[PDB]
Amino acid sequence: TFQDVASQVFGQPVGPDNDGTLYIFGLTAKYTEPEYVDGRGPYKSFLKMLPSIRWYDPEHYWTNGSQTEGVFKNEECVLCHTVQTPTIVNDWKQSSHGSKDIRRGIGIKKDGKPVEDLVGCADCHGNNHQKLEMPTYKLCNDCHPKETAEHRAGGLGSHTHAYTVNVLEFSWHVGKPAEEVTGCAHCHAIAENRCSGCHTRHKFDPAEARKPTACRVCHMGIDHDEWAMYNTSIHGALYEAESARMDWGKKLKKGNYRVPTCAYCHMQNGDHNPQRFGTIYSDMGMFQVDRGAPKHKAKRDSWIKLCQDCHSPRFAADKLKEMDAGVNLSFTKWREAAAVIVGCYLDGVVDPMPEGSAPDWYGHYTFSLLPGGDPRFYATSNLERLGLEMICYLTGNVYKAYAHMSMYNQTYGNGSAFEQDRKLVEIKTEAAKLRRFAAIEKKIGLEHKSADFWKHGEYLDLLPGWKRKPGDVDVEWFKRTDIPHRANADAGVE
Amino acid sequence: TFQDVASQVFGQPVGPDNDGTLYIFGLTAKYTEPEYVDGRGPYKSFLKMLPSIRWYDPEHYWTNGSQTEGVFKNEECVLCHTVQTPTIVNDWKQSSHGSKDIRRGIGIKKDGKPVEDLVGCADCHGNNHQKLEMPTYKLCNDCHPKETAEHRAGGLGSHTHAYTVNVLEFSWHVGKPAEEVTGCAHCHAIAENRCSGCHTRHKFDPAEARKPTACRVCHMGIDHDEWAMYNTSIHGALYEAESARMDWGKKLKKGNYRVPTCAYCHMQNGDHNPQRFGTIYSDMGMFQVDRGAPKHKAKRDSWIKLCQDCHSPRFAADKLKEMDAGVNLSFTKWREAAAVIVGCYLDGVVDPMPEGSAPDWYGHYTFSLLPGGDPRFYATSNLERLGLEMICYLTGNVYKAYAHMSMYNQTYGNGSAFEQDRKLVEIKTEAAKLRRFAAIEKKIGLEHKSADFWKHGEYLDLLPGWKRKPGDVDVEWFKRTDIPHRANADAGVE
Amino acid sequence: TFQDVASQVFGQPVGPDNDGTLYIFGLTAKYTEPEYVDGRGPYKSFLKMLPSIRWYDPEHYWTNGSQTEGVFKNEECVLCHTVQTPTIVNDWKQSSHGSKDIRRGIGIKKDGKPVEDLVGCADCHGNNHQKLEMPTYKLCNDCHPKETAEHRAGGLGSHTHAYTVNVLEFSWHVGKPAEEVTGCAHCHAIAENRCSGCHTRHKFDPAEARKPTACRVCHMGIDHDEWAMYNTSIHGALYEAESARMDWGKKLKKGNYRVPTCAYCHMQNGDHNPQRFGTIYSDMGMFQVDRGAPKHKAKRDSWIKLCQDCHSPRFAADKLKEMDAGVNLSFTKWREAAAVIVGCYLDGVVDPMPEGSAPDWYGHYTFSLLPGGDPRFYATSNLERLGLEMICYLTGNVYKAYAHMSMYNQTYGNGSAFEQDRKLVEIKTEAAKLRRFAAIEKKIGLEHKSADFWKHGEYLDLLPGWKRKPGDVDVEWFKRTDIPHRANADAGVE
Numbered sequence A, B, C: 001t002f003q004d005v006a007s008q009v010f011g012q013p014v015g016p017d018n019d020g021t022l023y024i025f026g027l028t029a030k031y032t033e034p035e036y037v038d039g040r041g042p043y044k045s046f047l048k049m050l051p052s053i054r055w056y057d058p059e060h061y062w063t064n065g066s067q068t069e070g071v072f073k074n075e076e077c078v079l080c081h082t083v084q085t086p087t088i089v090n091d092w093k094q095s096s097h098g099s100k101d102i103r104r105g106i107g108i109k110k111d112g113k114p115v116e117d118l119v120g121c122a123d124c125h126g127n128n129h130q131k132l133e134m135p136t137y138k139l140c141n142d143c144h145p146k147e148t149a150e151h152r153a154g155g156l157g158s159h160t161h162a163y164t165v166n167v168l169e170f171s172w173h174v175g176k177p178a179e180e181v182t183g184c185a186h187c188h189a190i191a192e193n194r195c196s197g198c199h200t201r202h203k204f205d206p207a208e209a210r211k212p213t214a215c216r217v218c219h220m221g222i223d224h225d226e227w228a229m230y231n232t233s234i235h236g237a238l239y240e241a242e243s244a245r246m247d248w249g250k251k252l253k254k255g256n257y258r259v260p261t262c263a264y265c266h267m268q269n270g271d272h273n274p275q276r277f278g279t280i281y282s283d284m285g286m287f288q289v290d291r292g293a294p295k296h297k298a299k300r301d302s303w304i305k306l307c308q309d310c311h312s313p314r315f316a317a318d319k320l321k322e323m324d325a326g327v328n329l330s331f332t333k334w335r336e337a338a339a340v341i342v343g344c345y346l347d348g349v350v351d352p353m354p355e356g357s358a359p360d361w362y363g364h365y366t367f368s369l370l371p372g373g374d375p376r377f378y379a380t381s382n383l384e385r386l387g388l389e390m391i392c393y394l395t396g397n398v399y400k401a402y403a404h405m406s407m408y409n410q411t412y413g414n415g416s417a418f419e420q421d422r423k424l425v426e427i428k429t430e431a432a433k434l435r436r437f438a439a440i441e442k443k444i445g446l447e448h449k450s451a452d453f454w455k456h457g458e459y460l461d462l463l464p465g466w467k468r469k470p471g472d473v474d475v476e477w478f479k480r481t482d483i484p485h486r487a488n489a490d491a492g493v494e
């Protein structure tokens, strides 16, 4: 093994990664599995989670783990936790739940009756310290049914199904070791199962939720993303300029704000179903659609009217037309790139071919840009990786750059037209190299066999694609009509 | 076509991109041209703009597009727009134009007479709602001649000619479909034609203009740029630390600020010609010049004295000498890279050679690093792309990192020495691959022909290089002496 | 030369880079050495510094350079500098040193006696303007012995030895021209030799030092780093949300803060030896260690208790276990990558082989991933560069992403699992190309010789590896036991 050789060269014994030894460049450590619990969803036969899933899907995983015993009153919760977890108490004392002086007389009710007392630690977590509860939106619904019903009103691609569908059914999550993608589970699960993603516990302050910081921890990246798209627009620059002195205590409403934030435009008038204002779900802009077409007029008009809070509607209309035009141009480059990549596959010059790689997460040796394949950036060919990057990392983000008025990210920036250009050159470069090698090998009669490292290795060998077998899919999950579903190749049903 | 094949594989009909259909990965959609208007400048015979250029070059493109009819008084503008575009009115009411209580008695005059009344919507836009005006600096000049004259005093590479010259004459803009580069036109045109780039409409607040946020929406990137260079210096960190509590109402003046901002150093004492403090124009640091040489002493001394607002002049002098030294070292790596790239061209081993690519925007098949060629990151070879990245994205930004005291971006960061190192390896890697292929093909007698995808494709076919013909340049534009010009290969004149 | 040819093509004379000429793309300029002074440390025989090192290692390099003569009283320092360097005086007047009204009666003493007077310019810099002093922590120790002793209590990898060891002994610094790495010397030297890195001169405000801005100018990057890791966690988002209105005047203490900052967690209770709270030094996470192993329990428990200021200890424990699991998974990908890269070397297919490159900074032609080699991103093969990037830029930062609770940077972001994936594909791609070339060349009988540009060039020729000779190491430095040392190949001792 690599570890055995490295052990003799660097003079450090081989051992398990988890024993506490400081391994020199990690060279002689052997991978050990962390403790797992079973994952939920249609791939439950092999999907794993780390036990810390208890906090994010508590209905299915939460158990008692406290060493403190007793049945306590609310005031006892506060007195002790003032010493034991002081900031939780400080947050709670600065919240409407724990302070009547900041209440606005909203008219909150539980079981038809007004909630006039403080809402304490015990009211949300329980009175028995050995049977403490870790809540979800189901608790909040007792007293905030409107916000909860909206939070639960989204379709696929919204907070509503972020975890239940888009973690448990998603290829990139199910195809990887659980501990590699813990952050995916939690980011998506906080969005779905909690009410603290925007207004954090334990202050639960709406003023905090109106700030772009309420969204950007999740809405960033693929490198750049809507955070960078917003922050590099003039709206984002004005947010930075005015944040410290503007009145964040004002409701999200026409005329209450000079500078628009994520919440202002997407949680219009406090609507807790922010997805619904979108024209149409486009798989993060990977699917091409002209939002200015006659069939989408009601949606376009609604956006124009939102912009009219602070602008001429003609100006707004022009800007959204620039989006449509910019998006349509961006897809010519993706189609150019796709032709080159698929062309290489049809000619059999891709190295490795699907047969030379580890099997995909379905357990098949299928080209990733075919229907039934798994588009990905890992455990695949360079050509396939670059293709996925073109469509996901770049083409989708061009739409986001136009949607958020980032002149820079539309053009020179990350996720831009010019990044698409450069990626197209990279793809053509790979393709050209592949074709020059194949042409030479053909002519001189060399029989090329793709290297073993495309197929086997310490990480590649951990992939679940190796252990897929017939009948390992819970197709009853996919038969459910109460949630939407991803169109996975092994779904087994409609 | 690609669309036809994809249509049969994915089961979605081919169609135009603009009909509103949600196209699966955009695979079966066909590119349609957006509505265009003719562009201005020396390439007016084929340059196009989207119609939204009306807002940014209104003198040449603005037309009535309102549905509201009438001739109104100022107070009528305000009453109705309070409902129709509330934030504009709120901004205006919080501006000196719309509120006497915040005026400073500057002594503003129009046609020799003092402006003592409110300056309302009608005073800037007109009284007739069917003949509304969209202004430029020409309006502001009526009452603010000093600021306007300075705004118009810059040379090439300043706000003064950002659009008129550096959009309308620039290869990367004229060589691309209009809708791909809308953001370029607007970013550059806002800088040139407007007075709202730093102090935004409709508050027009100088305190806002003093903040780095007044500059960073435009002065960012190539990936990193002067924003990142400033933000990652100790000055930038202190700006973030002190922004919320410092007094931004103070004039840009020696002793009024602890933390220097872009405006402080470049709009010294409120000068609206920020380019003039620069030692010399260097094409964004792509041209090498030692700013510490005896011939530039007056400029260096002026910078040292600016720094002396808050520092020892000896310290400042040392720091600017570090810039000079760091810059000069950076150019050894670019010259190393250029030798390798040009060497490959001279040996004819570049794939594709210029003849194998689409023609450049001049309509020629010329190597991009020759005089008369078009240095670019798109529609070119990987080797040429990497070269352009070395000089533009990296070498120029090394200067910016030193100029703005970013220890990190000088060394490990984006646009740094170490990024130059890595790019040099990438260039040598490409060169080495090209030479190994050519050596093999020579010896075995394979006649390599560069792939068709370097030349043709859905995006490449839209490029204006294909439709260039003799006599399509307005050389009278280039003959103008009232504006500077870019030294374009097809200029036809001096 | 390149310059001579370029001179004839572009029509600009060859000349020295430093004469002030504006060189077109820098093509015809010739590199000149800047003025140097000798560097300190074990490579003093050839290590150079720019003379500006005077400010950062003043004990060894500071000299008089003032034109102002006289012996002055404190009040005279202030009166004149109010005109000459106004912000220094403004800072000083707003500091406890210069204003009794903001003193807290800490009980500061010098030579056993209470310091009750103002501490003026002369008290820190001297009274004679021709013998002015540029201080280090040695000055501050006179009145602040506790903070200084802690600042000096760190081991290797802390502020305490940042410059003395990790600049003067480090391969990447000693192997490069001085002016390329000025920023390295200063960043590391400010951390070691000064007391102004966090609370800047001349205000020396602890409230400023508590902010993340006190750390991020140095603690950023390798592209992303702990700044990005912190800023993209929910803690970082809350810092941005609350910074403008929170009370930064509160001591770093349990219950004084809702949002934790770098200082809060690493300078626990004002401890000026922030390294000591770390479990173990791991060379920036390049060495693999399971911080959750039984042997590290005291450290893990201490972190859990720190988190318990604001959280359940069970939650904190789970989060740190996610770190351990995530880190261990990350090292499988590095070991996979290392096997591929070393495998290529063992098979002799790396282009260039070490013999085809310039010598490393030791003066040897050694493969960079061997013991005694120099792991690097510059002046090496693409395969070796990509390897260094995998372990340093990526694998180390995965640990940082988990340590700072950045769900995004653990997974999709910079320095993440998915970036590791992509880098692994890049490495395998390079390896596969190298093996396909070698297999062809073998079969057709082509004797490949690696290109000259891997070995010689304008930058490569400046490297100190060329001028290394026996007996050029000051091994007495490495024999010192009062400082730690790097395990350099040419150390000559234990």
Ligand code: HEC
Pocket: A095, A096, A097, A102, A103, A104, A105, A106, A107, A108, A109, A110, A115, A116, A119, A123, A135, A136, A137, A139, A140, A141, A142, A143, A144, A195, A196, A199, A204, A205, A206
């Ligand atoms: C009833 C028993 C409650 C439950 C369970 C939860 N909340 Fe609540 N909430 C409650 C009251 C009586 C109040 C004050 C209403 C008033 O008249 O002002 C609140 C208020 C909030 C708000 C607004 C906070 C503010 O504006 O400062 C938030 C955002 C909020 N509550 C959130 C919230 C969440 C996420 C809950 C589940 C975990 C939750 N509440 C439960 C009553 C009750």
Ligand code: HEC
Pocket: A106, A137, A140, A141, A144, A147, A148, A151, A159, A191, A194, A195, A196, A197, A198, A199, A206, A207, A209, A210, A214, A250, A251, A252, A263, A267, A269, A270, A271, A272, A274
């Ligand atoms: C971000 C996407 C949010 C999520 C997820 C949740 N809330 Fe929210 N909340 C959000 C903002 C931006 C605001 C202010 C909106 C406004 O109109 O300005 C709020 C407000 C609240 C309130 C106060 C309502 C009141 O009448 O003033 C409550 C009670 C509240 N939110 C409840 C709540 C619950 C129960 C949620 C999950 C189950 C929840 N919110 C999620 C931001 C977002």
Ligand code: HEC
Pocket: A212, A215, A216, A219, A226, A227, A230, A231, A235, A260, A261, A262, A263, A264, A265, A266, A275, A277, A278, A279, A280, A281, A282, A284, A285, A291, A299, A303, A403, A404
């Ligand atoms: C108003 C000025 C906006 C602000 C400020 C923010 N966004 Fe936005 N977003 C805006 C529009 C007009 C669009 C296009 C919608 C269309 O149907 O035309 C978008 C789109 C997005 C999306 C995707 C929505 C989808 O495709 O349906 C997301 C996820 C998104 N926006 C998020 C986002 C965040 C987090 C913001 C702050 C950082 C933000 N937006 C600001 C308009 C506005």
Ligand code: HEC
Pocket: A157, A166, A167, A170, A172, A173, A181, A183, A184, A185, A187, A188, A217, A218, A219, A220, A282, A283, A284, A285, A286, C407, C408, C411, C412
């Ligand atoms: C929070 C820090 C995120 C992490 C970690 C990952 N995802 Fe994500 N995801 C996030 C956002 C805000 C978006 C919405 C973008 C929008 O414009 O819609 C997404 C979207 C997805 C999707 C949809 C993909 C598609 O079909 O278009 C999927 C299925 C998804 N995310 C899953 C997922 C998983 C499991 C990840 C790691 C394996 C991953 N995401 C990381 C936020 C975040």
Ligand code: HEC
Pocket: B095, B096, B097, B102, B103, B104, B105, B106, B107, B108, B109, B110, B115, B116, B119, B123, B135, B136, B137, B139, B140, B141, B142, B143, B144, B195, B196, B199, B204, B205, B206
């Ligand atoms: C005369 C008819 C005006 C025209 C046309 C424009 N402005 Fe003006 N401006 C005008 C007055 C009377 C004032 C107040 C002067 C006073 O005594 O304080 C101003 C002020 C400004 C300022 C400063 C704002 C402030 O400090 O709060 C700005 C930055 C400004 N004006 C900008 C500006 C621009 C960009 C214009 C063109 C679009 C413009 N003004 C036109 C009078 C008149």
Ligand code: HEC
Pocket: B106, B137, B140, B141, B144, B147, B148, B151, B159, B191, B194, B195, B196, B197, B198, B199, B206, B207, B209, B210, B214, B250, B251, B252, B263, B267, B269, B270, B271, B272, B274
């Ligand atoms: C950024 C590059 C700017 C552009 C473009 C314009 N202005 Fe400006 N303006 C700028 C700043 C940083 C400040 C404050 C400078 C200071 O001394 O502190 C200002 C100020 C104004 C003022 C007020 C002048 C007064 O006497 O107090 C006015 C009237 C104004 N600016 C006018 C103006 C006009 C007409 C411009 C374009 C035609 C314009 N500014 C552009 C920042 C920048």
Ligand code: HEC
Pocket: B212, B215, B216, B219, B226, B227, B230, B231, B235, B260, B261, B262, B263, B264, B265, B266, B275, B277, B278, B279, B280, B281, B282, B284, B285, B291, B299, B303, B403, B404
């Ligand atoms: C003073 C401390 C500065 C601050 C703060 C900002 N910049 Fe700067 N800039 C500074 C100098 C000393 C230099 C070099 C000028 C030379 O002649 O020596 C620069 C250079 C630039 C440039 C290029 C100018 C040119 O080449 O002539 C630009 C475009 C620039 N600076 C922009 C910029 C911005 C937008 C800033 C804030 C984000 C900023 N600078 C801060 C000094 C100072």
Ligand code: HEC
Pocket: A407, A408, A411, A412, B157, B166, B167, B170, B172, B173, B181, B183, B184, B185, B187, B188, B217, B218, B219, B220, B282, B283, B284, B285, B286
């Ligand atoms: C605003 C978001 C920008 C976008 C979009 C683009 N450009 Fe730009 N440009 C911008 C800045 C602030 C700078 C000045 C940098 C400095 O140090 O001088 C520039 C510079 C240019 C130049 C000069 C190039 C040279 O010869 O050195 C050109 C000709 C130019 N910019 C044109 C241009 C076009 C048309 C773009 C898209 C096709 C592009 N820029 C994008 C700001 C921004």
Ligand code: HEC
Pocket: B310, B311, B312, B313, B315, C077, C078, C081, C085, C088, C089, C092, C097, C119, C120, C121, C122, C123, C124, C125, C134, C135, C136, C194, C195, C196, C201, C202
């Ligand atoms: C001790 C408490 C000091 C007092 C009181 C003053 N200065 Fe200072 N200064 C001090 C140190 C530790 C340093 C070295 C840099 C660092 O950050 O550690 C300095 C440096 C200077 C400089 C040179 C650097 C610069 O920014 O230009 C000068 C010109 C200087 N200080 C001036 C000076 C004046 C005039 C003072 C009285 C108002 C003064 N200093 C007080 C620490 C101390």
Ligand code: HEC
Pocket: C095, C096, C097, C102, C103, C104, C105, C106, C107, C108, C109, C110, C115, C116, C119, C123, C135, C136, C137, C139, C140, C141, C142, C143, C144, C195, C196, C199, C204, C205, C206
């Ligand atoms: C004695 C002669 C001093 C020397 C030399 C330095 N400092 Fe000092 N410092 C001194 C006093 C009398 C005070 C005020 C104590 C009080 O009772 O409040 C201070 C205070 C500071 C602090 C705290 C500042 C504050 O809270 O606002 C800082 C951070 C500080 N001093 C830093 C510092 C540094 C870095 C020095 C070396 C360059 C230094 N001091 C020297 C007395 C003396």
Ligand code: HEC
Pocket: C106, C137, C140, C141, C144, C147, C148, C151, C159, C191, C194, C195, C196, C197, C198, C199, C206, C207, C209, C210, C214, C250, C251, C252, C263, C267, C269, C270, C271, C272, C274
């Ligand atoms: C960042 C890593 C720092 C360095 C390097 C130095 N100091 Fe510091 N200092 C730091 C912070 C975050 C704080 C506040 C800590 C708190 O408990 O909240 C301080 C505080 C000071 C004080 C005030 C102590 C008092 O009793 O209130 C002084 C006098 C001070 N620091 C001195 C000092 C000196 C002499 C240092 C270098 C020699 C130094 N500090 C370095 C941040 C950091």
Ligand code: HEC
Pocket: C212, C215, C216, C219, C226, C227, C230, C231, C235, C260, C261, C262, C263, C264, C265, C266, C275, C277, C278, C279, C280, C281, C282, C284, C285, C291, C299, C303, C403, C404
């Ligand atoms: C508490 C919530 C933290 C905040 C806020 C910051 N960091 Fe941190 N850091 C934290 C821990 C629990 C760890 C792992 C330590 C271990 O032994 O378990 C880290 C680690 C780092 C490191 C490396 C330390 C080492 O390996 O021993 C550095 C250099 C670091 N942290 C820096 C850093 C900075 C600059 C921060 C703000 C931007 C920051 N940390 C915030 C916990 C906490």
Ligand code: HEC
Pocket: B407, B408, B411, B412, C157, C166, C167, C170, C172, C173, C181, C183, C184, C185, C187, C188, C217, C218, C219, C220, C282, C283, C284, C285, C286
């Ligand atoms: C400030 C802007 C930096 C620059 C410039 C460079 N380094 Fe650095 N370095 C910095 C930080 C905050 C860290 C600590 C990270 C942690 O988690 O420990 C480091 C670390 C190093 C090390 C340790 C490498 C190892 O053996 O693991 C070395 C030897 C080092 N830095 C040296 C160094 C040199 C000389 C650089 C340029 C040649 C370089 N660093 C740049 C901060 C910064």
